[PDB]
Amino acid sequence: QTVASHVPFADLCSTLERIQKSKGRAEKIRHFREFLDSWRKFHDALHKNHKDVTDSFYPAMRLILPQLERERMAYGIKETMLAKLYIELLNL
DNA sequence: AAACTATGCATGCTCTACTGCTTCTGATCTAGTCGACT
Structure with a gap:
């Protein structure tokens, strides 16, 4: 029941664009903080019953910081390979 | 004088081979990426 499975990628893309x-x-900073706070609140709501949880912000943090x-x-x-693909x- | 048989012709179907044209496949080759070294 990972949180990342309930968060559309479109929301993260929109936050990054903003x-x-x-x-x-x-x-x-305000946009990032609001997104993180929403994620944390959803995580708290989802894992009310579970005791040991490995879920974290890693799924989004890795994408936000690819380096x-x-x-x-x-x-x-x-x-070049991406352009060729x-x-x-696309059959252009 | 009548019946059988040798001889031939015309045509359709089939194996077999050969020559030539077109297309597909195996083989001979340069660009991109990662890595090794110095």
Whole structure:
């Protein structure tokens, strides 16, 4: 019953887009804090009955900070490979 | 004078081979990524 299974990726993408659009640091910090607080409240609500929980903010934190990813090996797809795959798949 | 048989022709179906054109597949080759070394 991980929290990440109830959080659409669209919400995280929208939060990141709002953070990027904002100019002042205050707005970015406010958006991130609101998202984290919502996640924490949902986590508390979900795990009321469970005693030992391994669920955390890792699923979103790893995506927010890809430069700190070490569990996942190199994807092997750089910009050129990604462009080639997009061209082939989209049938452009 | 009548019946049987040798001879031949015309045509459809089938195996077998050969020549040539087109397409598919195995083999011969450069770009991208990770890694080794110095």
